[PDB]
Amino acid sequence: PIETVPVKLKPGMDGPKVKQWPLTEEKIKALVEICTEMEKEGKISKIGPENPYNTPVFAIKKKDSTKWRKLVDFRELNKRTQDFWEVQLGIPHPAGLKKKKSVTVLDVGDAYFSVPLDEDFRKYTAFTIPSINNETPGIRYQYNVLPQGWKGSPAIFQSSMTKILEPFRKQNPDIVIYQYMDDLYVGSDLEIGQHRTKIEELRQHLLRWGLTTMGYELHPDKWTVQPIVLPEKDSWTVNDIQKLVGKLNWASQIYPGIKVRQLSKLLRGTKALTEVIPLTEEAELELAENREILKEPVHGVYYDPSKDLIAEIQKQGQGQWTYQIYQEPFKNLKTGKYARMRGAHTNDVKQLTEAVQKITTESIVIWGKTPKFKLPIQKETWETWWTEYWQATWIPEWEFVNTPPLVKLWYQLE
Amino acid sequence: PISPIETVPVKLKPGMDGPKVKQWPLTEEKIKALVEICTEMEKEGKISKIGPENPYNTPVFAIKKKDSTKWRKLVDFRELNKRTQDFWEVQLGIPHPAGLKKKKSVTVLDVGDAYFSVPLDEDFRKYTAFTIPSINNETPGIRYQYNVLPQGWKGSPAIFQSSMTKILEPFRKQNPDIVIYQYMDDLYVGSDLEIGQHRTKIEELRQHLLRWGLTTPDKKHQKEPPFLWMGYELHPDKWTVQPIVLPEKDSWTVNDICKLVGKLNWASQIYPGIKVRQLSKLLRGTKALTEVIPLTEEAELELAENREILKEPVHGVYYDPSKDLIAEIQKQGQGQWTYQIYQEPFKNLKTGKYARMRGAHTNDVKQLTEAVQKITTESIVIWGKTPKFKLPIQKETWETWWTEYWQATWIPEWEFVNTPPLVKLWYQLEKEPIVGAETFYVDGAANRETKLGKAGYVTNRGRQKVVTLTDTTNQKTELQAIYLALQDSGLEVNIVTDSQYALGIIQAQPDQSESELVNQIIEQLIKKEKVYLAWVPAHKGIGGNEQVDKLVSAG
DNA sequence: TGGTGGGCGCCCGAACAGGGACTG
DNA sequence: GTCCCTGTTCGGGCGCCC
Numbered sequence A: 001p002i003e004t005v006p007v008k009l010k011p012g013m014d015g016p017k018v019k020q021w022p023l024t025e026e027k028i029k030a031l032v033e034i035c036t037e038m039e040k041e042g043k044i045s046k047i048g049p050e051n052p053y054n055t056p057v058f059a060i061k062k063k064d065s066t067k068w069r070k071l072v073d074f075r076e077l078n079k080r081t082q083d084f085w086e087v088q089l090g091i092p093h094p095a096g097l098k099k100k101k102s103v104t105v106l107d108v109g110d111a112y113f114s115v116p117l118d119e120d121f122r123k124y125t126a127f128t129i130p131s132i133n134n135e136t137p138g139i140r141y142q143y144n145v146l147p148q149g150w151k152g153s154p155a156i157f158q159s160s161m162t163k164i165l166e167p168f169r170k171q172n173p174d175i176v177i178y179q180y181m182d183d184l185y186v187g188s189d190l191e192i193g194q195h196r197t198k199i200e201e202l203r204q205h206l207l208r209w210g211l212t213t214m215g216y217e218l219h220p221d222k223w224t225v226q227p228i229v230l231p232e233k234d235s236w237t238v239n240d241i242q243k244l245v246g247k248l249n250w251a252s253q254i255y256p257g258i259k260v261r262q263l264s265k266l267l268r269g270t271k272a273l274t275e276v277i278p279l280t281e282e283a284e285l286e287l288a289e290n291r292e293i294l295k296e297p298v299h300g301v302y303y304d305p306s307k308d309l310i311a312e313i314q315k316q317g318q319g320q321w322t323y324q325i326y327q328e329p330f331k332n333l334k335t336g337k338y339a340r341m342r343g344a345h346t347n348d349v350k351q352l353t354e355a356v357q358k359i360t361t362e363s364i365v366i367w368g369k370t371p372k373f374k375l376p377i378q379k380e381t382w383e384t385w386w387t388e389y390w391q392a393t394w395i396p397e398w399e400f401v402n403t404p405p406l407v408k409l410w411y412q413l414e
Numbered sequence B: 001p002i003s004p005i006e007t008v009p010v011k012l013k014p015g016m017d018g019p020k021v022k023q024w025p026l027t028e029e030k031i032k033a034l035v036e037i038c039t040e041m042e043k044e045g046k047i048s049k050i051g052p053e054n055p056y057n058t059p060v061f062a063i064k065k066k067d068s069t070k071w072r073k074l075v076d077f078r079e080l081n082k083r084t085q086d087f088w089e090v091q092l093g094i095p096h097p098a099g100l101k102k103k104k105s106v107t108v109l110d111v112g113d114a115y116f117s118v119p120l121d122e123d124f125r126k127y128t129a130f131t132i133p134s135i136n137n138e139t140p141g142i143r144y145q146y147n148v149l150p151q152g153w154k155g156s157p158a159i160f161q162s163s164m165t166k167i168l169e170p171f172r173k174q175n176p177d178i179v180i181y182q183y184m185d186d187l188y189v190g191s192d193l194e195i196g197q198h199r200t201k202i203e204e205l206r207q208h209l210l211r212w213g214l215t216t217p218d219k220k221h222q223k224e225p226p227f228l229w230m231g232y233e234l235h236p237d238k239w240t241v242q243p244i245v246l247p248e249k250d251s252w253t254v255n256d257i258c259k260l261v262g263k264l265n266w267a268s269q270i271y272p273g274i275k276v277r278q279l280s281k282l283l284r285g286t287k288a289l290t291e292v293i294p295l296t297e298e299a300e301l302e303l304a305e306n307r308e309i310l311k312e313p314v315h316g317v318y319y320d321p322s323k324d325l326i327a328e329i330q331k332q333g334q335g336q337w338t339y340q341i342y343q344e345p346f347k348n349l350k351t352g353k354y355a356r357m358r359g360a361h362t363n364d365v366k367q368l369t370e371a372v373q374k375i376t377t378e379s380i381v382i383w384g385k386t387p388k389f390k391l392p393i394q395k396e397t398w399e400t401w402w403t404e405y406w407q408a409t410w411i412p413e414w415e416f417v418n419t420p421p422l423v424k425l426w427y428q429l430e431k432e433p434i435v436g437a438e439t440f441y442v443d444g445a446a447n448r449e450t451k452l453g454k455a456g457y458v459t460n461r462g463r464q465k466v467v468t469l470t471d472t473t474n475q476k477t478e479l480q481a482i483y484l485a486l487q488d489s490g491l492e493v494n495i496v497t498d499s500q501y502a503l504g505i506i507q508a509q510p511d512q513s514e515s516e517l518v519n520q521i522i523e524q525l526i527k528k529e530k531v532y533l534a535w536v537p538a539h540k541g542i543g544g545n546e547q548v549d550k551l552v553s554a555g
Numbered sequence C: 001t002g003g004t005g006g007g008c009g010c011c012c013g014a015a016c017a018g019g020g021a022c023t024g
Numbered sequence D: 001g002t003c004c005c006t007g008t009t010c011g012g013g014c015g016c017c018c
C-alpha cells in the first residue's frame, strides 16, 4: 500500500462542527448516488453519531452536463488544518500565468482518491447526507482517501503531480501549468484551437495515470483595472460640486495627491442646491490635477501572502458590479468592474455569485490565493440560493455587510 | 429481545469520571413500578446487578406513558451527560404530513421498549450505575447497571437513531419502493400495493425488525384510517392535526403565555392567519417564568382573534409531485405575515406565519422578502424544491425597490395578487435635487460627557433654527436635525446632512422602526411630495454645512 | 406532583462583533 | 483609545414528536 502521511490540525484547534443545510431532491438524489459509489470503491465509509465532527455537502451540475459533482464545503476544516500551505509546501507562484493568452481550468480533483488519507485524520472529514422531509435521520460518512476540497490534498499529492506532469512540462516549457486545490490551471500563448489541442493532449497524460481528469477559456490578458473617474460638465451646480467634493475627499485616502480646497471655495455661503456655480479658473484647474492624479497608479502596495486578500463588491445597478481587492484598507491591488445582462429578469443573487467566482478565479491566477469576500447582501438571501449558481470546485470565505450607500457612489462609472 | 447489532463506542470526556449521586426519595407507587420493570429487564439481561466494584450512581425515576397505564423508567443523567463525549446528532428535523404523497396502503408501527432493545457499549456500562431503593425494611435495596440504552442519557437518541437506520438499511435495499418514514422508533410505512400484498410486506418488515431485536406490538395501526402519527390523524385523502386546546386562564403569566404562543405556533401550520405579535410582546422584560402579566388590550384582542379561528374545521392534503408547489402570502399587521401552500386552489398542503423582526429599521418590502426567503428553505426541506409565489405586491413596486436598493436582493418566480393589504413603498427619495425647493443644511452635535446637544438647520432662504436637546447622543442629534427640517419645510424640500449614519437609515426607505424618533421622521417623509437628501463630509468648511455646524456647536 | 434525553419551531435577552464618530 | 449603533450568536423558556 502507498504509505500514509501524518497530518495534524493547528495547535489548540478542534475539527469542524458545521450543520448540514437543506438540499433539493435533485441534489440529495445525486449525493446519494455518488456516495454509495464512493463507498463501493472504499473511498468513504459509513460512520456513527459518536464522531463529533461535521462539514456540509452538496452537488453542482457542471456546464450542461448529465454529471453531478459532489462538493464538500471544507473551508472550516481547511482553516483548522495544520499549514502544509506553509510548513509542508514549497510552491512559488507562477507569475507568468497571469500573462498568458488563454488559460484553461481542468478539474484534477479526481486524482486524489488514489492516495489513502491518514487514519487518524479521517474523523475530521465527516459529512452528513440529508433526506427529504426528514423521512430518515442523516446518513453519515467519512473519507478514507484524500478529499477533494481539502487543502491538505494538493500538498500531500504534490510530489506525485510533479512526476506525472514533468514530461508534459518538459516538452511544453512555453505552456505553464499551475495547480490549486482541485484545479489545474493551464496557460498558453497559442491561438485558440491549438491551445485547445494542447489541453486535450494534457488530458491524455492525465489519463495514462488515471483516473481520470470545466470552466473553459480564461484570458488573463483581457482583464483590466477600473479607475475612479470624475464627471465632465459645462455648468456645475452647488449639488454637482457638493457631490464632486465628497467623492474626492474620500478618493484622497487612496490617492493622497488629491486636493479639494479650491473647489470647496465655490461652496462658500449657503446656496440652493440647484443653483449654477461658475468654476473659478483655479478650481477649474484643480479639477485638472485630480483628474490626472487619479491616473498615476496607487503607490506603495505590496502583496503579503501571510495576510488574506479582502474583496469588496458593490451593486452598481442595471447589471453593473464593482470590486476592489486589498489587504490593508485603501491599498487596492486590483479594482475592477463586472457587467451583465441588463435584461428584465436579472437575478441579483446569481450575478453576485458569478461575480465572486470571477473575482476569485482572478485572485488565484494572480496570487494563488483565495480572497475573503465582503458581500453586499443579506446572509439568509445569500444562503437560500447561492449554491444554485456555484460552478467552482473551491469555495472562498466570505462575510455579509450592509455597505454604506456612499461607498458605491465613489467607484460608480460614468 | 436485545438487538444483535454491534454497540457504538462511547467515551467520557477527558479527565472526567462517572457520577456519584445519591438516589432521591421515590413514591411507593413508583418504586413498585420500578422493581416490576427492573426484575423483568434483569431477567432479559438488559440490566445486571452490580456490587461494590461500581462506585458510581445516578438517580432514577418514572412517569406514565401516553397510554397513562404503563410507566416509563427514566434516569436523571444530567451529571453524566455533562461528562460524556460529544455526538453529532443525526435527526436533522421533523417529517411533515404535507410531505407525504398519496400511497395505496398505509401502516403505522411502534417498537417495544425501543431503547431497551439496543445494546450499550460494554466499556461504558459501569457509569450507568443506578440503584432501586425498596421498602426500607425489606431491602437496601437492589443496585443495577444498564447493558442497553437508558432513557435519559445524552447519547441514547442519536445512537438509537443511527442503529435504526442501520437496522432498516437492508429492508430498504430489498424494498426501495416501499416508503418508511422513520422517526426514532415510530414507523410510517406506505406502498402502492393492494391491501393484502402490502400486509404481507408489513409482515416481512416486522420480522426483519424482530430478527434485529425489535418487537412490534399492537400498537399497530392497520386497515384503519385514520392513522395517528407524529401528532396528526392521517386519512386517505386528508390529514389533520390532533385537536389543539389553548389554555383559558384569567391571569396569564410568563409560563402561561410562553405556552400559549407555543400552542398557536404549533397551530399555525394548518390554521391560517394565526398571529402572536401582541401576545409575544408581553413576554418582554419579565424576569421569571412565573411573573404574572396583564394582557394588553391588543394582545387581548389578538388572542380572541386566534380563538375564533381555531373554532373552524380545517385539514391538509397530501403532496402530488406532478403539480406545482404554490405559496401565497398575505400581509398581516405589525411585520406579521401568513402564507398558504397548495397545488390546487382551495386545498392547502399546509400554512404558516412569518413575524420575526430583523433590524432596528425596515420596511414592508424587506420583510416580504424575508418571508419569501424562509418559506423557500422550508419547502426545500419538506418537498425538496422551491414553490412558485403569489405575493400582494405589484411588479412595479418590486422593480422600483430592486433598482433603488444598494444591496443584492431577489425573489424567485412570482405573480401579483390583488389581495389587500398590498405591499408598497411608502415614499420615494428624489435622485436629483429639487428645483425651487428650500435647501436645508442640517446638523447636530452632542457633548459626550454631559449628554447635552443642539440640533438645527440653516436654509438657503435665510431661516435658521436651533433646538437644544438633553440626554442625547451625537447620532440622535443628527437624526433630530433631519426631523426639524422636515417639520419646517413645504411639500418639497432639499436636505443636506453630514451624517452617514442618518443618511444610511433614511435611504433604505424604512416604514417601521424601534426608534420613536425615526418613526416621527417616517411620518413626515410620507406627508411630503418630494424629498431629496444629499451628503457632505463634515468639518470641511462646506457651508452651509460650515454655518449650521457653527450653530449646533455650543457643546 | 416533580426529577431525563435528542430533534425542529418560536420568541426573547444576553454576550459579543464590527463600523462610524468623537478629544484635545 | 471612547462612546454609540447595529448586526450576529448563543442560550433559556415554551410548543410538538419519540
Ligand SMILES: Nc1ncnc2c1ncn2[C@H]1C[C@H](O)[C@@H](COP(=O)(O)OP(=O)(O)OP(=O)(O)O)O1
Binding pocket: B065, B070, B074, B110, B111, B112, B113, B114, B115, B116, B151, B152, B184, B185, C004, C005, D018
Ligand atoms: N420523555 C422521554 N425521555 C427520554 N426518552 C424518551 C422519552 N419519550 C420517548 N423517549 C424515547 C425513548 C424510547 O425508547 C423511544 C420510544 O418512545 P416510545 O415508543 O413512546 O416508548 P418505548 O418504545 O420505549 O416503549 P413502548 O412504546 O413499547 O411503550 O423514545
Ligand SMILES: [Mg+2]
Binding pocket: B110, B111, B112, B113, B114, B185
Ligand atoms: Mg415504542
Ligand SMILES: [Mg+2]
Binding pocket: B443, B444, B445, B478, B498, B499, B538
Ligand atoms: Mg454632523
